[PDB]
């Protein structure tokens, strides 16, 4: 969810600022996996709202979307999501069952990149 994710981000950033003794936060850059169905505008907004009343208020939020990388072990083959994108309703779904390894015929492919979300850049003012 957008608000819960943004809340996690806010709490985490405020905690880190409480660790480094930051007086104020000026800018925040967050890298998000494309597997997340959250809308960037909603998340950004929620972050902007929960930052109010804190030292991280008025910070510039920048989102960086990373791609998703799948790797099937049945033939040790790696492929991307954009390749399977072009091949309409309910297009996004859990890749666990929705799609296979396009080469072998077995769907047990391990998610390597694009599943998680992490903060990339923080502008600390102390």
């Amino acid at each position: 969810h957008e608000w819960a994710l943004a809340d996690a981000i806010v709490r985490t950033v405020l905690d880190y600022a409480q660790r480094e003794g930051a007086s104020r936060v000026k800018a925040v850059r967050v890298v998000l996996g494309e597997l997340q169905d959250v809308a960037e505008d909603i998340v950004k907004f929620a972050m902007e709202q929960l930052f109010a009343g804190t030292i991280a208020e008025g910070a510039e939020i920048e989102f960086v979307e990373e791609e998703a990388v799948f790797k099937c072990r049945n033939c040790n083959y790696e492929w991307k999501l954009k390749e399977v994108k072009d091949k309409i309703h309910f297009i996004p779904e859990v890749v666990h069952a929705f799609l296979a390894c396009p080469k072998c015929g077995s769907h047990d492919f391990e998610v390597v990149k694009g599943r998680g979300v992490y903060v990339a850049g923080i502008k600390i003012e102390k």
Binding site: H1, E2, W3, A4, L5, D7, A8, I9, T12, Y16, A27, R29, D41, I42, F45, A46, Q49, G116, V117, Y118, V119, A120, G121, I122, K123, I124
Partner: protein, 400 residues
């Protein structure tokens, strides 16, 4: 800027239990529509009116139906009685669908202990038949009158044929005994399992029905009043509770029955006069039963509205002229409870937007409804307490 790496490890309720008893109960089940309230502004009135039904679209049609009202309430222009009654008809269909779905798919597995595929042949055959009939009826009403983008300000985009309306009336006439049977079935099943205590009820008050109204409903009613909303859970806050008159209160079918009892008529009035004791103003579960009663009332009233709609055979959607600096606060009565739409318009564009959901009203008392004393199993009881309020979606998590 400076680049670093912090991997972030990423809807239900949480109850922390203990050997000496339960200590802390908390929930973060819904988000704030604030985002929409900030993106709908600056856009066209119709644009914002197209963005609004995105919030809790599980019951979409209701929102766009009160939004427009607020818009009219902003421009001062009043819709005709015919189109108003039509809005009330669509509203009724939505009500029927939502309540049928909720009551039968959620409350019946709670009491009958069903899980997995709800379709069974040993039982729930006639009940699934009825539920499907009601669902299909309501959804068909919404598909005919309303897919989407049908309801426009001042007047509608497209109106169905009169024959479809007559046939709809016939369908209702055929659907009534199933709603009566539903009311019976929900008159049979259990209340308070016990969670029963003083809960303020809150529901709008209309002249003939609790469908649409301009005055809030409480032991001390009010036409336009803003109640104290409290930001809670701040450590783990996802939403802000609401305190009417400085106290947790409840909305829903129960509230509409308590406040608008005398406004009721027909078979529903008789069933109410009969089961007057079974639905108490202090029990969350009776709401379910009440909804079943509302599956009867709104089935009959609709017909009258149709006979109010056939008062004028030629029907044409009127048009309105926008008004600058216009404040319009429509307070409707969604199936979830009273829904609030506050819209102030300036220069034909959105200036102020404040939308409040019934779920937010029920959240405080639902948090207060937890006097559950059991030793697990209790997750199911809590889930029944929650589904007694008809949430959009819910789940129980117990920390031991």
């Amino acid at each position: 800027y400076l680049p670093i790496t912090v991997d972030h490890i990423a809807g239900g309720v949480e109850i922390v239990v203990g050997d000496d008893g339960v200590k802390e109960v908390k929930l973060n089940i819904i988000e704030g529509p604030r985002f929409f309230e900030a993106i709908t502004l600056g856009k066209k009135l119709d644009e914002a009116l197209a963005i609004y039904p995105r919030i809790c679209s599980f019951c979409s049609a209701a929102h766009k139906l009160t939004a427009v009202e607020a818009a009219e309430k902003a421009i001062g222009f009043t819709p005709r009685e015919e189109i108003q009654a039509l809005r009330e008809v669509l509203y009724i269909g939505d009500m029927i669908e939502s309540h049928a779905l909720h009551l039968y798919l959620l409350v019946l597995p709670d009491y009958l202990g069903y899980s997995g595929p709800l379709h069974m042949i040993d039982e729930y055959k006639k009940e699934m038949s009825i539920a499907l009939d009601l669902k299909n009826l309501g959804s068909w009403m919404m598909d005919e009158l309303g897919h989407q983008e049908n309801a426009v300000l001042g007047g509608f985009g497209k109106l169905p044929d009169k024959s479809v309306l007559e046939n709809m009336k016939r369908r209702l006439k055929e659907a009534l005994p199933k709603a009566e049977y539903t009311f019976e079935l929900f008159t049979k099943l259990e209340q308070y399992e016990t969670h029963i205590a003083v809960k303020p009820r809150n529901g709008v008050y209309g002249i003939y029905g609790d469908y649409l109204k301009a005055s809030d409903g409480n032991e001390f009613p009010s036409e336009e009043y803003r109640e104290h909303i409290k930001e809670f859970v701040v450590e783990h806050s996802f939403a802000k509770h609401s305190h009417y008159h400085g106290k947790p209160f409840m909305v829903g079918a129960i509230s509409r029955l308590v406040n608008n009892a005398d406004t009721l008529y027909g078979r529903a009035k008789e069933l109410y006069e009969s089961y007057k004791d079974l639905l108490r103003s202090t029990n969350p579960f009776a709401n379910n039963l009440a909804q079943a009663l509302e599956l009867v009332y709104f089935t009959e009233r609709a017909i009258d509205l149709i006979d109010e709609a056939l008062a004028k055979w030629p029907i044409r959607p009127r048009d309105e002229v926008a008004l600058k600096d216009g404040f319009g606060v429509s307070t409707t009565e969604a199936p979830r409870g009273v829904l609030v739409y506050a819209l102030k318009v300036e220069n034909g564009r959105v200036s102020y937007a404040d939308i409040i959901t019934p779920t937010a009203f029920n959240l405080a008392m639902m948090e207060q409804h937890v006097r559950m004393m059991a030793e697990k199993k209790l997750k199911l009881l809590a889930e029944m307490v929650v589904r007694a309020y008809d949430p959009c979606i819910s789940c129980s998590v117990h920390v031991a």
